[PDB]
Subunit: 696 residues, 2 copies
C-alpha cells in the first residue's frame, strides 16, 4: 500500500543520507586518498556542506572526460542520461493524463467487494481500476503510441550521437597495436609445416605488399597457473614474516584453517620458503619445456600489417574458401585479450556454448525457486485467509509495513548479488578471448536472466500468492482476469525493489566499502615495505557487466508500467538522476578502465531497449485484451511492427559505424600518421606485442 511505499522511502532516504555522510567523512581522511582518487595515481596526476562533491563532479565537460577516462565510461554515463531523456516526458504526460483518468471511478469498490484482496489506494492509479469503456481505453492506446514514438525518437537521436562520437574518437586515437593486427584463429593443421610457417606463407602470398609480422599463440596456461600460485604463496609468506616480526615469540603457524580438519605439520616461514623455491624450480622447468614444445602452439596467430588500411581489409573480408578456416577478426589490445581462452580448439567453442546454455536454463529455474520465496515474503500480506503464521504479522502494525516494504527488496538483492560472478564464470567458460566480449556476453546473459526471473517470475509468483484466494474456488474462466488485474500489485512491489536496489546500492557503491577494506588489510597485514604497493589500487572497471543489465531492467519496468500504472516512473527518474551523478564522480576519480572498445557495445544497449519496448507493447495488448476490450488488440499490434521497422532502420543506417571499419578513415589515419612521424619503425614497435605476458 501507499504507507508501505512511504515507509520504505523514508528508510531508504535515511540510508542514502547515512551512506553519503560516511562517504564524506572517509573521503576527507588523508590516508584514504589512495582509494577514493584511484584514477589520479594510475593516470599519474597526484601523489601523497557534504554534498559539494555533486556539483563539482558536473564541471568537467565531455570533451575532456573522453580524454580523461575513455569512451566506454562516457557512453555509460550517456546511458544513464538516456534514461532521463526517455522517461521524464513520458512521466509528465502519463501522470498528467492517466492519473485524472484512473482516479475517477466508483465501480471497482463493488467489484472489489465480492472477494478481491487488492489494496486500497495504490492500485487506484492503474489500469485495473477502471472497467471496460471507450474513451478511457482510447486514451490509454493513444498514450501507448505516444510513449513508443518518443522513446524511438530519443533512441534514434542518441544512436546517431554515439556513432559520431565513436567515429571521431577512433580517427584521432593513439597508436595502440590493435589497429594494425587481426586475430587469425582457425589455421588448418599441416604435416610438414608448423603453424608459424603456414601463417607466413598464407599471409605473404594471399595478402602481400602489406604483411609485416605475426605471433602465434602458445598454450602457456600451465605456466600461468604456476606463476599465479607462486605469487599467492609469496603473499602468504610475506604476511607470515610480518606476523613473525610483529610478534617474535613463537613461529607456530599450523595450517588448521581449511576443510576436513586438516592442517597438522606446523607450517612456519621455513615451509613457505621451501615451497617457494620448489615452485620457482617447477616454473623454470615448465617455461623451458613450453618454449621447447611443438604441441604448445595452438592453431592461431596475431598477424600485424604495415597500414591500418590493410588490417581493416583483412578483418572485414572472408579469407578463404572455407568460412570456418582462417577466421579473421579485429585483434583486441594486448591488455585486453583473455589469454586463458586462446587454448580452446574451434570445436569445443560451440560445444561449450551449448553446455552453458543448458547451465543458464538450470540456473534460471533454480533461481525461480528463490524468486518464489522472496515473493512469499512480506508481500504475503494477502495470504491471511489461511492465517497459519499470523504471529509475525500481528506483532505490530508499524513494523509489518516496514517488513512489508524493506525485506523483499533486500532478500532479492542479496539473492542475486553473487549472480554477476556466476554469469562471468559462465561467459568465460565458453571462451571469448577478450575481456570486452566477455563483459558484453555476461551483460546479455544477466539481461535475459533478470528479465525472465525477476520480471516474469516475480509477477507470476506475486499473482499466485496474493490473488490465491480469489481463484482457489473459482473456475478456469476466471484465471485470465486474475492475470490481467494482478500486474499493478507487482507494480507496488517493483516500487520498493527499485527503491532499495537502485538508491541504496548506488549510495553503497559510491561508499566503496569492498576496495577500501581490501586496501587497508593489504596495506596493514601485507607488504608495507616500500613505495611498491601501487598495485594495491585495484578499483576495477566501471563494471559494464554488473551495471548495464540493471539499468536495462529498469528501462523494461519503466516502459511496461508507464501506461499500465504511471506511479512507477518517478522512482525510476530519481534513480537515473542519482546514478548519473554518482557514476560520473566515480568515472572522474576512481575506476580505471581495463579495456578500450570505444563504445562498441552501444548496438547491444539499443537492441535491449528496443526489446523492452516490444515487451511493453505486447503486455499492454494482452492486458487490455484480457480486460474485455474490442478495439485494443487491432491497435496495439501495429506498434510491435513499427518498433521493429524503426530498429531495422537504425540498424541499417547507424550500426555500420560500430560493426565495421570504413576504408577511407583507415587511409586518412595512415596518411596523417605517415606525414607526422616519417621515421617510425612499425616492425620494432609491433613484433613483440601479443607475446602472452608470462613470457615477458
Amino acid at each position: 500500500t501507499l504507507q508501505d511505499i512511504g515507509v520504505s522511502a523514508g528508510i531508504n532516504i535515511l540510508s542514502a543520507f547515512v551512506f553519503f555522510i560516511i562517504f564524506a567523512v572517509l573521503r576527507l581522511q588523508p590516508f584514504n586518498d589512495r582509494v577514493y582518487f584511484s584514477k589520479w595515481y594510475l593516470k599519474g596526476l597526484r601523489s601523497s556542506k557534504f554534498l559539494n562533491w555533486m556539483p563539482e563532479a558536473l564541471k568537467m565537460p565531455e570533451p575532456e572526460l573522453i580524454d580523461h577516462a575513455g569512451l566506454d565510461s562516457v557512453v555509460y554515463l550517456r546511458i544513464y542520461w538516456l534514461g532521463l531523456k526517455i522517461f521524464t516526458p513520458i512521466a509528465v504526460l502519463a501522470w498528467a493524463v492517466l492519473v485524472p483518468v484512473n482516479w475517477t471511478n466508483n465501480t471497482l469498490e463493488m467489484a472489489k467487494q465480492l472477494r478481491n484482496v487488492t489494496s486500497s489506494d495504490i492500485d487506484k492509479l492503474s489500469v485495473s481500476n477502471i472497467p471496460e469503456y471507450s474513451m478511457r481505453f482510447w486514451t490509454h492506446i493513444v498514450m501507448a503510441y505516444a510513449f513508443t514514438i518518443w522513446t524511438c525518437y530519443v533512441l534514434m537521436k542518441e544512436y546517431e550521437t554515439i556513432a559520431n562520437m565513436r567515429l571521431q574518437f577512433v580517427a584521432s586515437e593513439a597508436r595502440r597495436p590493435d589497429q594494425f593486427t587481426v586475430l587469425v584463429r582457425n589455421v588448418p593443421p599441416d604435416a610438414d609445416e608448423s603453424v608459424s610457417e603456414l601463417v607466413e606463407h598464407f599471409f605473404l602470398v594471399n595478402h602481400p605488399d602489406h604483411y609485416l609480422t605475426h605471433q602465434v599463440v602458445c598454450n602457456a596456461n600451465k605456466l600461468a597457473d604456476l606463476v599465479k600460485k607462486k605469487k599467492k604463496l609469496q603473499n602468504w609468506l610475506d604476511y607470515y614474516q610480518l606476523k613473525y616480526a610483529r610478534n617474535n615469540s613463537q613461529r607456530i603457524m599450523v595450517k588448521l584453517g581449511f576443510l576436513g580438519l586438516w592442517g597438522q605439520k606446523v607450517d612456519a616461514i621455513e615451509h613457505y620458503i621451501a615451497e617457494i623455491d620448489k615452485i620457482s624450480k617447477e616454473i623454470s622447468k615448465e617455461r623451458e619445456e613450453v618454449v621447447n614444445d611443438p604441441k604448445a602452439i595452438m592453431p592461431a596467430a596475431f598477424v600485424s600489417f604495415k597500414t591500418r588500411w590493410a588490417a581493416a581489409v583483412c578483418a572485414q573480408t572472408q579469407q578463404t574458401r572455407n568460412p570456418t578456416q582462417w577466421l579473421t577478426e579485429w585483434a583486441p589490445e594486448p591488455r585486453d585479450v583473455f589469454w586463458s581462452n586462446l587454448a580452446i580448439p574451434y570445436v569445443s567453442l560451440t560445444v561449450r556454448r551449448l553446455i552453458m546454455h543448458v547451465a543458464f536454463f538450470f540456473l534460471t529455474f533454480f533461481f525461480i525457486v528463490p524468486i518464489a520465496f522472496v515473493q512469499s515474503l512480506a508481500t504475503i500480506e494477502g495470504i491471511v485467509k489461511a492465517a497459519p503464521f499470523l504471529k509475525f504479522i500481528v506483532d505490530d502494525k508499524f513494523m509489518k509495513s516496514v517488513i512489508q516494504g524493506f525485506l523483499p527488496g533486500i532478500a532479492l538483492k542479496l539473492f542475486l548479488a553473487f549472480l554477476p560472478s556466476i554469469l562471468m564464470i559462465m561467459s568465460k567458460f565458453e571462451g571469448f578471448t577478450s575481456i570486452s566480449s566477455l563483459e558484453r556476453r555476461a551483460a546479455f546473459r544477466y539481461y535475459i536472466f533478470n528479465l525472465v526471473n525477476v520480471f516474469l517470475a516475480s509477477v507470476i509468483a506475486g499473482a499466485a500468492f496474493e490473488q490465491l484466494n480469489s481463484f482457489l474456488n473459482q473456475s478456469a474462466n476466471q484465471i485470465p482476469k486474475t492475470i490481467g488485474v494482478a500486474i499493478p500489485m507487482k507494480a507496488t512491489f517493483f516500487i520498493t525493489y527499485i527503491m532499495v536496489d537502485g538508491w541504496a546500492g548506488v549510495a553503497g557503491e559510491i561508499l566503496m566499502l569492498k576496495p577500501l577494506i581490501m586496501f587497508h588489510l593489504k596495506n596493514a597485514f601485507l607488504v608495507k615495505t616500500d613505495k611498491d604497493r601501487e598495485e594495491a589500487m585495484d578499483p576495477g572497471s566501471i563494471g559494464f557487466n554488473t551495471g548495464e543489465p540493471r539499468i536495462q531492467l529498469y528501462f523494461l519496468l519503466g516502459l511496461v508500467y508507464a501506461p499500465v500504472t504511471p506511479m512507477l516512473l518517478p522512482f525510476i527518474l530519481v534513480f537515473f538522476a542519482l546514478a548519473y551523478i554518482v557514476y560520473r564522480h566515480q568515472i572522474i576519480n576512481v575506476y580505471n578502465q581495463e579495456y578500450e572498445s570505444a563504445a562498441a557495445f552501444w548496438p547491444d544497449v539499443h537492441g535491449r531497449v528496443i526489446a523492452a519496448l516490444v515487451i511493453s507493447q505486447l503486455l499492454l495488448m494482452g492486458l487490455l485484451g484480457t480486460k474485455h476490450a474490442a478495439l485494443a488488440a487491432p491497435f496495439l499490434i501495429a506498434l510491435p511492427v513499427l518498433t521493429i521497422g524503426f530498429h531495422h532502420f537504425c540498424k541499417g543506417r547507424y550500426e555500420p559505424a560500430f560493426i565495421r571499419y570504413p576504408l577511407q578513415e583507415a587511409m586518412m589515419k595512415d596518411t596523417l600518421e605517415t606525414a607526422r612521424e616519417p621515421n617510425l619503425n612499425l616492425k620494432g614497435y609491433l613484433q613483440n606485442a601479443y607475446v602472452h605476458p608470462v613470457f615477458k
Copy 2:
C-alpha cells in the same frame, strides 16, 4: 471425388500426349530447326518412337552441361531434382504408413451423417477421417518429425553441393569484365568538381595502387527511347514495303487500326520514310546534346581495378564514414545491367519500394476476388442446398465431373498467366540495375503472391463455399472444427490444379508455341532479305521469374499435405520427374541465357523451402490442435524451432560461398591469369565496357 481426379487425369494425359506428338512433328520439320535448336546457332555449332528425345536429353553429363549452357540452368535443373529427392521417400513412407491408418475408420460416416457435405472416398485417406485418439495421432506426429528431418538433411546436402559447384565454377571462369569492377552509386555531389573527378580522386587516394579506370553512368534514357521508336518504325516500314512489293496495285495504308477510330490521312510508305528521317534527325540531335550536357551524368560510376583481389576488397568493405554514400556492390556484366534504372537517385529507390509494396497489397486483394470466383467454380458442387443454378449441374453426370475437375484449373491458370509480367513491371519500377536481381525480386514477389492468394485464399474460399451449409445455422463454436476439416477438400482441388498447371503447362512449354509463331510471322511478313535474321531467335532465358515460384508453391503444397493427406504427393512426383526431363532438353537445345550469376540465387530457393517447411508444421499443429488433441501442440512446436535452427546453421556455414568473395580465391585467380597471359593490357580491355550500349 476420386472420379473427378480420374477424369482429369485422363484428359490431361491425353493433352500431354497430343502436345508431345505435335512437338515431335514440328521438330522433324527442317524449316523449324531455327527455333527448336536455338542454343546451337547462338553458340555457333549448327547451320542450315516419338519419345526418343527424352533418353537422349539425359546423356550429356553435368560437367559438360555447365560449360554448354551455364550454371544457373544447371542449378535450376537441380531444383527439379531436389524436388524428387525430398519427396519420393516422404511419399513412400507417408503412403505405406498413413494410408492403412486413415482408411481404418467407421465413425466418420455417423459424423458425416448429421449434415456434413464432404466427399465419399477421397477424404478417407486424410487426417479429417479419424477422430481424436492416441496411437494414430502419435503416428502422425512421428511422421511429421521424420518428414522434416529428411527434408532438412536433403536441403543441407544439396546446399553444400551447390556451394562447391559455385566456388569451382567461379574460380575457373572466363575473363568477364565484372570481376574487376564494382558499381559505386551514391557519389555525393560537389560544386567545383564533376562526378568523374570525384570518383578519380576518391578511388585514387583512398584505394590506391590498384585503381585502373572508371566510367560514370549517363542518363541516356531519352536517347534509348528514341532509338527503340526508330527501330519499331523501321519494322513497320519494312513490313509495308514487303506488302507493297507483294501486291503492287495500291498504296492504301490508312492507319485506322487504333483506338478512338483515328487513322485518317492514308499512311503509305512515304509517311514512314519521312518519319524515319525525322526520328533519325532527332536521335542525332539528342545524342549530341546528351554527350554535351552536365545534368545527364548521374551520381554513379563503374570503377575497374587491376586485380580481382582489389575489386573483391572494394566490394565487400564499407567505403566511407556514411553508410549511404559511395555504396559499392559487385558490378554486373555489361550484358546484365538494366541500364534504364541507373537514372534513379538513391532516394526514389526507397520511395518506389514503398509504393510498389502498396501496389502488391492491392494486387493481392484484387486477385483474391478471382480466387473466390474460381473456387465458386466447379468445386461449387456442394452449394446445391440452395439449388438456384442446378441447370448446368443436372445437364449430365459425366461432363459435370469433367467440368468439376478441369475448369477450376484452367480458370486459375489463365487468371494468373499474365501475373509474372505484372510482377516483372513492378520489380523494375523500383529499380534494380541488373536483370538477375530483377528476376530474383520478381520470383520472390510471385512466391509471396501465390502463397497468399493461391494457397490461403483458395483454401478459405473453398471452405466457405463448400461447408457453407454446415455452418450457416450453427454457432461460433463450430467454425474452428469446420476450418480443421476443410483442408482435404482443398487437397482434392489442388490435385487437379497441380495436374493441369504442372503437366499440361510443361508439355505446352516444350511445344514452344509463342516463339515459333513469332518467328514465322517475323520471317514471312518481315525482313526476309538476307542472312540477317539471326536476331529472330529470341528463345528467352530459362525464365527463373516464371518457373521457380511455381515449383516453390508445389514444394509448399507437397510438404503441407504430406502428413495431412498423403495423396497429393504422387502427382507432385510425376510433375517433378516430367519437368526435369522437359526443362533439361530445353536447356540443352533452346533457351539462351541473358545473364550469368553463377547460381547466386540458391540462398533464395533454400530460404523459400525452409519457409514452406515451417508453414507446413504450423498448419499441422493448428489442424491437430483444432482436432481435439492434447499432446499434439507441445510436440509440433519444437519443429518450427529445429527448422529455424538448422536453417541458421546452413546460413552461417554455406551461405558465404554465395554472398561474399574469398580473398584467397581472388589472389589465386589473379596469379594464374598473370602467369598464363603476361602481356595482357587490362586498361584497353576494360575501359570501354560499361558505356551504355546506345553510345556504341
